[PDB]
Amino acid sequence: GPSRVRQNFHPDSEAAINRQINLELYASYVYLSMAYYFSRDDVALNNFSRYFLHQSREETEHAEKLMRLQNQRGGRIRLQDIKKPEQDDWESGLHAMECALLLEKNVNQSLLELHALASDKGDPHLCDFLETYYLNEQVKSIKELGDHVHNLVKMGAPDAGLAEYLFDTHTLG
Amino acid sequence: GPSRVRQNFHPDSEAAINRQINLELYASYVYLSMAYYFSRDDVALNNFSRYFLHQSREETEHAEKLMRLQNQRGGRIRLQDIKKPEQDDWESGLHAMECALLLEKNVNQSLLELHALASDKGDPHLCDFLETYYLNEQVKSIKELGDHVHNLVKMGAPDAGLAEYLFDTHTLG
Amino acid sequence: GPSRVRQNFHPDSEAAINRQINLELYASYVYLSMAYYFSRDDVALNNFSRYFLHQSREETEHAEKLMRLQNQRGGRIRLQDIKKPEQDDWESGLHAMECALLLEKNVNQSLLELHALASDKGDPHLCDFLETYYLNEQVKSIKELGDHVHNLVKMGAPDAGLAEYLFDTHTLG
Amino acid sequence: GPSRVRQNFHPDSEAAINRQINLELYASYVYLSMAYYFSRDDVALNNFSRYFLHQSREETEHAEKLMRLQNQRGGRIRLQDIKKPEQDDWESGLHAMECALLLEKNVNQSLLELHALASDKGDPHLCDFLETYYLNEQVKSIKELGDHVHNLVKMGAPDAGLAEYLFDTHTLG
Amino acid sequence: GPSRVRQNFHPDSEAAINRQINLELYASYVYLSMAYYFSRDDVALNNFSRYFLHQSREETEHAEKLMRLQNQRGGRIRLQDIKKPEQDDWESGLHAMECALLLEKNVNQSLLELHALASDKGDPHLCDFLETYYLNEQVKSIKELGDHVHNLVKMGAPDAGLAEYLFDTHTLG
Amino acid sequence: GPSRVRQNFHPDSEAAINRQINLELYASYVYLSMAYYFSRDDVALNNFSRYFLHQSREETEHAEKLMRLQNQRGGRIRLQDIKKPEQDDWESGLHAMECALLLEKNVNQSLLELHALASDKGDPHLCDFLETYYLNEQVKSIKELGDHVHNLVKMGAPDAGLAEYLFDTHTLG
């Protein structure tokens, strides 16, 4: 017996949504890691720290919106371990921005696969949800990180002593 | 000679939109019926009454938005009789909530068929309209009614004397 | 066993009130039809549209007040199909005003029959209700439509090109 | 080496977006032309002028939003000459409204082709962008121009001396 | 070469603090799970949901305060996977409250072990931190959950139909 | 038969004013190009972007004021294609500032030729218009661009990594 709410909601979509929830929580955790890297006494770039912390909290919102969608559609949320980030030392402002950019493109590819699946299962509600709340948000994030990486590289990060310091103060400040 | 406004608007879509307008008006009428059931002297659940009345007025808005779309696209509105509801006595708070839930799923299936037709006729304007204003609204409605049915059942409606009374006061109040 | 509220309320009055509810809902539907006629791209008289839409919503209020009276008196509301309007194309501003005037006189004759019945059944509560909320409202409506028809005719509607256009802007604007 | 931001963005979409940017700029220029036609001493319809000027500025916004999308997605903006409008003398209020209507339908057909291309290239971000910001805007524009053409024709434009004068004052005023 | 900030900070304390960070994040995840259990269509206790969501966000704050302490003292944060909760279906309002109570006592025992370690390593800064921000907070949480479990049991949860419903509305509302 | 408004307005002035309108529109387009260069992901100097966008909108105002003058004097506006800018890639902050400076001097030389023509045709109204609204505006623009080029060169643009970045933030910010 399915949910009395469930309608036109494919089991494969339910499962893909649970995989997406894990990926969003993972991304939250990556950014939380980055945030506290920047507030080390031997790094001390407070606006990089604030930036990544804000990203971490936004990833939690992305996760919750998918958990709500699961409930709305009569799916059942199935949580899995949240894997720790690949690094605990993020090396530099530039390196963390580059890692974030790769992570955002990977999440985007996941969301595009999810939309393709929704399209295959004739679920326009799911397609619209991803278009309204996920796809443009990812385009905006990737473009912003691309901008940041570009500026840091041009400024001489990470080796030029003033580069990360000034970018912290001006762009992220 | 078509409307001088008409563009990429399939006659089958025009007709399906007229069928949808009738269904929305019908749903308005069902809820109007339910609303005045609850204000009978031998039922007297005023917040159930207010709930269904609010649903009835929202269905009229859904109808009007489709009538406006028809005009916008250069279709011609073709009205049909609005059939009376299946019951004039809705038996209980629970039974009316269950009937509303079935009606919302039926309207949803209609809207999903309409989107499939819009998709087949390559009408992305029509697809977007249904996604923006109809499909999520139906998901939200069905989930809300599912919540209400669940609570009423658990509380012992309709036979437990306090159940509908307390649900009227707390959830719908 | 009657309603424990019912007193001095004739079954014939209960039935006539149910017939009146259907007529009010019908009138609502006629005006809704007219409203969306005027917002066609090949008619485009927006203040005619607004006028008829306002009339449509007021007819719904008339219907609801009768549904409430039914409940107040311990009658049982019995809904019937709402028949579609006689036309989907209302031809002109003048023609719609003339159709509205005929409809208002027909509704008035119905209400006068209802009062005669209430009088025959010695129901002064019912007589007063119709006098307070229905009879003067109909006199005012018929007089207003008579005024509008008169002006439109004098102005040269529907064939004189400026007539409906200017009446839309000045009288209904 | 592509943009480090670029993802799931087909070269054909990039090119079609550059063609759309040119068309939007062209439409801006057409309306700018119309605006200054209406403020000639031998035409002097100031509200027609204001109307077309407002349309011209909105077309520039449409162009810029596409230039931003190009950048967001990692495409490269490629500008081309903006061709002058077909006329410098727009003959009458009615004739300009009819020309605008044809132009809006042509732009709409272009945008529908662009959506079909986005659909073929599996770019739901691009599809959504066009649905959110372009397709409904075009439906609304075409319907509004259809309304205006209808009224002007009925009023006797362009030959009836009061028609354009009164429409300027009432509808566009 | 240690942190140039590090003073009187035992490697065993650094490690125990990293274990505590994982436990806090785990507790956040447990409550997030519970929160979305309560907003299922077949559970639909919205104030239970809000309660657990608030608990989840507070656990994140506990985690962050420990990550900040690590940085303050010149320790190095070492993140580990966050294990999924023991259940995805939390059975009832009462059962979730009982699970929360057990979890809070387990976290408390962990914090008491951490204080004993800080005491053994002569780290009064660490002892004070745990006393100021953790130990009383846990006493308050455990007492509150004890109160809630007591009331739910007395009310007849989970089998009495009104119990969880009324507790949701009154105590958690 | 000339405009009934036309007085002391030489056909050569009318033509030169139409050439000036094209040049102003061209300059608008050049700056629009520059603006969207700076918001590329591989350039990302947002205040350069804002600067050039503001210049682009001001050029449109210059064009419109000349179109209004044409109408005021009873001339007839004759629009021509707006040629695309010489580059779509503007290379650097410095290079775009240098290109803008050359463009402003070229527009200035055009306006000085126009004043010489107005002087030759004994049109003091035209001379005054150019003096009031064009000539000082160009002096101010050229001086400002000269200032900017000077600072960028001194700072080490384009090769010194901090130069354009800091000038974007401080001078244009």
Ligand SMILES: [Cl-]
């Ligand atoms: Cl008038």
Ligand SMILES: [Fe+2]
């Ligand atoms: Fe995300």
Ligand SMILES: [Fe+2]
């Ligand atoms: Fe509906």
Ligand SMILES: [Fe+2]
């Ligand atoms: Fe779509």
Ligand SMILES: [Fe+2]
């Ligand atoms: Fe009525």
Ligand SMILES: [Fe+2]
């Ligand atoms: Fe009387």
Ligand SMILES: [Fe+2]
């Ligand atoms: Fe446009």
Ligand SMILES: [Fe+2]
């Ligand atoms: Fe905690």
Ligand SMILES: [Fe+2]
């Ligand atoms: Fe200029």
Ligand SMILES: [Mg+2]
């Ligand atoms: Mg591992």
Ligand SMILES: [Mg+2]
């Ligand atoms: Mg029947």
Ligand SMILES: [Mg+2]
């Ligand atoms: Mg019939």
Ligand SMILES: [Mg+2]
């Ligand atoms: Mg040409």
Ligand SMILES: [Mg+2]
């Ligand atoms: Mg495990």
Ligand SMILES: [Mg+2]
């Ligand atoms: Mg060329």
